[PDB]
Amino acid sequence: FLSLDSPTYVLYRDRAEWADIDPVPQNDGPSPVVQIIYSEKFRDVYDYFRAVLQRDERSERAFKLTRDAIELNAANYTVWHFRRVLLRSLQKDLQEEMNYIIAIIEEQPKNYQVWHHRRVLVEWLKDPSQELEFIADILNQDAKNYHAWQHRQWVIQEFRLWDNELQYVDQLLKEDVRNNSVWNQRHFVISNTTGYSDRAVLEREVQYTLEMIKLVPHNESAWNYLKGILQDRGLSRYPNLLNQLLDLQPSHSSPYLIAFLVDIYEDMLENQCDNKEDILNKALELCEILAKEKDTIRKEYWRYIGRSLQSKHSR
Amino acid sequence: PLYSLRPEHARERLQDDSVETVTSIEQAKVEEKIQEVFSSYKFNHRLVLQREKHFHYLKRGLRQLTDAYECLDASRPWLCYWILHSLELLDEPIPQIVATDVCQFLELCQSPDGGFGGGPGQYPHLAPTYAAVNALCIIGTEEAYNVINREKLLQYLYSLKQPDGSFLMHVGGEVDVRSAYCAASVASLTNIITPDLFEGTAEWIARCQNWEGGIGGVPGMEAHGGYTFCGLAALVILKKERSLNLKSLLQWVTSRQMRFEGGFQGRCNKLVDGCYSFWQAGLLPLLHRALHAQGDPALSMSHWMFHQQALQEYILMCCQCPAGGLLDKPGKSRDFYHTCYCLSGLSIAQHFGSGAMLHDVVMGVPENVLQPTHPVYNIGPDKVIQATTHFLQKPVPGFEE
Ligand SMILES: C/C(=C\COP(=O)(O)OP(=O)(O)O)CC/C=C(\C)CNC(=O)CCCC[C@@H]1SC[C@@H]2NC(=O)N[C@@H]21
Ligand SMILES: [Zn+2]
Prior knowledge:
- The structure holds two protein chains of two kinds.
- Chain A is mostly helical.
- Helices cover 66% and strands 1% of the residues of chain A.
- In chain A, α1 (40-54) crosses α2.
- Chain A is elongated.
- In chain A, 37% of the residues are buried.
- Chain B has helices at 22-41, 51-61, 76-89, 96-109, 126-139, 142-147, 150-160, 177-189, 201-207, 225-238, 246-256, 276-279, 283-293, 308-318, 336-350, 381-392; strands spanning 64-65, 351-354, 357-360.
- Chain B has a two-stranded antiparallel ribbon with strand order 2-3.
- In chain B, a hairpin with a 2-residue loop joins β2 and β3 (357-360).
- In chain B, α14 (308-318) packs antiparallel against α15 (336-350).
- Chain B starts with 21 loop residues before the first helix and ends in a 9-residue tail after the last helix.
- The interface between A and B is large, with 72 and 85 residues.
- Zinc ion binds at residues 273, 275, 328, 338 of chain B.
């Protein structure tokens, strides 16, 4: 009802409906540190929030009061907790509360307390109907918002809502193939549905990632995805892969390719292949090319990788 | 010269492969801006941590803040920790009267249920609990150690603990790896760890490591510096680092250092930011210690496995605000969090030590050296020792008997 931006906003201390109740000031003690010189609207709302809290008053007026207190500091988890208790005691309508939180999140989408609130609402309502399209609109403003992906994954796991996620994932990859949050989602989805062992799946996946690497050679996410889905199989059970990557080299080089080649060679050496000495030299050559020339930022990483390879692939 | 100013360093600019997405448009916006900053040093010929300016910023902030800060009204022990720690790295001694005021303040933030809240009378929460205990350790006095109610602290931790090994961030709260780190940090410093307190936790943190090698905030999520710092450091405390796949974790962090900017990003294909000078690069010492404990023969004996020089160059040239305090990146406004973590970042990038090696790298004038920070707790190593000592004089509650 009475808005903080209304021209006719009146401080709580000046409101006749709160005459019966004493404000409770914050005790910061006698020489405070990190002392915030609160504006007057703020101190006034929070003086009354404290008073309402202290006596645990479960009033409709305390409920409207919490709205204000949140508008002034959406990060006050004490206020949010109290609001949830009131939501219950006053037996409030959660559909409007859902609309409240929708607007709030839209306004401050990078805030833990507010996603968590929404989530608690969804557990109470056991009703995910609004969740994915909601989440999709936030992601539409910030495609990498971490809270939004977390919440997405949580809905999907709890209400088993797997059936369209790979569709959404494919679309976002089309929008920004560099969106790591979306490759993480692809992986999240696939490992929970089919898994990666079905050969047909793994092949579609590897082919896709390679189409994507060719289209955009310096996109690390694709390369990270490639390594992720394969490395654990063992890279060397896929003999064509070595050659298919060597083919790219001339036309589509990138430190990622060079690094992958090393990962293959390392798998080869673990697996007692032929030309041990020759493979080991190709690897150490590449490490040196990385450390000295094509990825000098990681010069310390690459020198430790070369020294590991020498250390254990020897005599 | 400096690494960033050498002419081959230009070959480290983004290659978009002629294919523009939002991800590359944004990265190029930043790189172009960082190139300006680099060129600005190279017009007249000279790298300086404006200590004196940072100190004024901090000294004032520690006492009083405008209503610009109404939104940190629930994070005030964070402000104590960030500012105290920053002063500590700058080798600034903290007056008896400031120290005492913080003790008394943090005492009013302490819940009767145990733990600490964002301010006086707020409910307890793992994050300010973590910050307050760290602030109290940095102070290091007996007054400060005694502010902490250890028995209620444990009860408070018990109340957050979940069947599957995770912790709630607060009662009625959320879980992610942060709670695990906060709990471990706090529990270990105060000597309140029991047999069953962190049971399941290591396995929980481990399920947060994902296909990228890094750790996400909860199982299934994208790998991120902050959560990855928290997970690994939490395992290191518990001594169960080996639950994780360290070789992949290594490949992931090292990759987070930006070839052009010099600093680190929080997750793959996102932007450089100074705070990750601590959250990402602080993983390197933790991993060095872990791989050393497993017998690794190939570990360097002078350097962490990142470009120490380049990181210091990033912090010094791009993340100092001329008025004092430090930044995420240029164009951004100072704050105490970034002041804290850039500096913690800088100290890590200056000070290598392993077993009995010690090797420093101080970019710019030598008055740039910070004091060392402990990479698990991110307070000073002296302070860690003193505090773990003091609280070892006490039994884990109970017992005793
Ligand atoms: C969700 C997330 C990052 C999201 O980043 P983003 O999308 O804005 O940026 P980026 O592109 O990921 O770099 C996790 C980061 C985690 C850490 C840095 C680990 N953090 C801690 O241990 C606590 C640091 C406290 C930050 C302040 S405390 C007051 C305020 N409240 C809060 O919850 N966070 C902030
Ligand atoms: Zn930052």
